[model samples]
Target: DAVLELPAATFDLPLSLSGGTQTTLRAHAGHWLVIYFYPKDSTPGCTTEGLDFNALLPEFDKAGAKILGVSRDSVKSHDNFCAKQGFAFPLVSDGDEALCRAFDVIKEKNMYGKQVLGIERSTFLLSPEGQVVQAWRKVKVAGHADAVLAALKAHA
Candidate 1:
């Protein structure tokens, strides 16, 4: 029911990464790829998660992995968030919902007793061949990056 292995759905959409570079998924095909989808940018939980990933970026790099955070925010917002938080990884803008739909991160969410559509907090670990190696749905911010790192070391 999900993209849990190679030959899964492949995305080549434009992405904003470090230094505000415009790139695509195919650009990082030969290394481990970490694509994390969050609800929004700059929100408390989102910020915490981004910061945790940023903190572990060096280690992730050491493990030969590249990280990308995705949200339904604009490129300007993503740039601002990256600058403000000093994120080493790139943040992909999924404003058109193309990426969201491909990854199935969009779902009904409950907030303040109201139901609305939002992106679910999730993470996907992709192998060097641009295939999914592991996935985490409804992710928790704490220790999540470390867990991803361990999984990368163990499986990737």
Candidate 2:
């Protein structure tokens, strides 16, 4: 059977985070992973969403799940964002949009009457073997982590 049907493809790219080396998606293959892609880091909505996930870290750990937040921001930006907000999750640096493109999260967005290509806020729940169990596209910030946690509980 194929793995990760939603992403339609698997991309193992170098991602720079705060760990001093480029990270990849290899950590997710054997465990359930929640990969959430956002437009930017340190923004109000992004901050709230990330903080929510941070707050639920214990719950997620008990459920044997890991959460990864992705954005086009650099490692420095992600470092500052997480340090400033005390988020325990790893935020992947998808600066070139390769991972976003593989996950089909890069698209035209309309903001303030201007159309621009950017990362669409989306989340994917990957199964233990890396298959896509669930996915949410163009996600709203409110209560989203809770919904994902509920799904994880159900699946577990």
Candidate 3:
């Protein structure tokens, strides 16, 4: 029930990415989708995670899945990030924070003992029918994408 309330699971929201636009639900429909939500673009941790996902993209495609990265950053920022890193997958831009709120990734966070509102790094594994098969909250960058890939292999 709680998982169902999460954005990608229940809400139908359209999103615009660096390359194109798609409904949130449509993007994951009829395929296993590895969707990760992060705070900003071009940051150290975010960049590494994006690159790792990029590296694993061929395998994901082979698995008939799409790896999508989402954030509140603008399309220009995503374009730059993808260009700089040579990312093969599209990063969706949630400029209005609508989808982020739907997914509940926009929350209060603590950084260096300071409290701030930001996107809590999270990942969702969605099945072919758009149902969430697995969820990871407050994800760490190191080896995170590998874990996701492994999960996809095992469960999807």
Candidate 4:
């Protein structure tokens, strides 16, 4: 959905904190939040996207925003990927796709001549009150982190 078209949404899905540390999404509030959904961890595009955000994480913090990545992978996979990639931002292992459906991120697409339902690359910028101020779907890995930063700055 378009940024302006998206209704203010909130979901209290589980968050996997690189260990077995299960947390809830609603626990993070009172500040700008960048919630992005990627298809799978350790994949090329996800890797680039994670690195892009990780590199500019301090900038996001300075701009009063926090970045969180979400994927349909398991906690084990997420932990290994984060440790291997050296990502400091928290990631959520949405194995049940609760958050994905809430945000309407899951879509069917042709993969290897087969149509499959999967999570599309999506990003949502939430204000302190948990309202979505900006959004991106089918996000391009390049320049996405900078674009999100710019949006956060414009709001700040």
Candidate 5:
């Protein structure tokens, strides 16, 4: 189930970053990529996770890695969250659920006794060549970025 080559067009999907930038997985071909899928914007787990990754972004840069977040939220909500938290990294607007579907991050979830299909907190590490190097599914926020950093170094 690992390293599935998703439809080529999936990587080419147009994506919008929080600061009004457009990018695609193919656009990040020259550096390690951290593409994290979260459930929502400004929620407790997602907020802390983004802040932790933000705090360690410089280290990730030194490792030649680029980080981007994705959720089913709109660019407006993402803009507000990024500005409010002063996040240097950008969150991708997956409003249409393309990336979420491509990455297979959407999973059955329970919220307040209701079953729902939601984006599971997932992170993927990609090589400079845009190949999948590692994937973290059903992630726990605590110390996760640190672990990703270590994985980057190990692969480096």
Candidate 6:
């Protein structure tokens, strides 16, 4: 798949807000947007990634960026994950796969020798105009947030 490149590709979808409300990309215009897609909520890798992002939320905010985590989990599941992890950012429930399909994060993978479809850990950095500025796929959690912050600063 061709990665979404800036000034041409953009994402706009109805996201299930963390508190069970609904929101869209239009609401976050005029600011840097970081949308990260994870496989599942509360898993080891996912939890670590979420915590790492949460720890740097303040810095991201200072850099004039907003972070949003996305998963296929239901709104209730997202609420529980956020409450348990104390995430400062909102997690989008992509139950209908609208956001997931828009981002093209879904993939086939082998888990315990069973092939299944799941979300590939990915992240997208969108400029204030909502154009995709950068994208990372099959991401590694370690130091990922810091790298993103550096990129955001450089872009700014």
**TM-score, per-candidate, Cα-based:** 0.87, 0.89, 0.88, 0.88, 0.93, 0.89
Q: Write the per-residue lDDT of candidate 3 for residues 2-109, one digit (tens) a residue.
A: 254564334467788886556566656688888899888999999999999999988888789998899999899998999999999888889888877877788886
Candidate 4 structure quality by residue, lDDT tens digits, 18-123: 6778766567678888999999999899999999999998899897788889998988898899999999888888888877888899999888899899999999
Which scores higher on TM-score, 4 or 6? Answer: 6
Q: Write the per-residue lDDT of candidate 1 for residues 9-109, one digit (tens) a residue.
A: 34566665445577877888789899999989999999999999999988898878999899989888998999999987889887787777777778996
Worst 10 residues of 1 by lDDT: 1-10
Which parts of model 2 are misplaced by more than 4 Å?
Answer: 1-11, 110-115
Residue 83, candidate 2: how far off, in angstroms? 0.6
Judge candidate 4 against the unseen true structure and give its global Cα lDDT, from 0 to 1: 0.84
Order the candidates by TM-score, highest first. Answer: 5, 6, 2, 4, 3, 1
Q: How accurate locally, in lDDT, is each candidate?
A: 0.83, 0.84, 0.84, 0.84, 0.89, 0.85
**Candidate 4: TM-score?**
0.88
Model 6 lDDT per residue over 63-122, tens place? 789999999998999999999999989999999877887778889878888999879999
Candidate number with greatest TM-score = 5
Minimal lDDT window, size 10, model 4: 1-10
Clashing pairs in 6: none
Q: For model 5, what is the C-alpha lDDT against the true structure? A: 0.89
C-alpha lDDT of residue 144 in model 4: 93
Q: Give the per-residue lDDT of model 2 (tens digit) for 1-156.
A: 333454433436667775446766665667778899999999999999999999999999997899999999988899899899999889988878888888888998688899889889999887787777788899999999999899889877
| Stretches of model 4 off by over 4 angstroms after superposition | 1-10, 110-115
Error of 3 at 125 (Å): 0.4
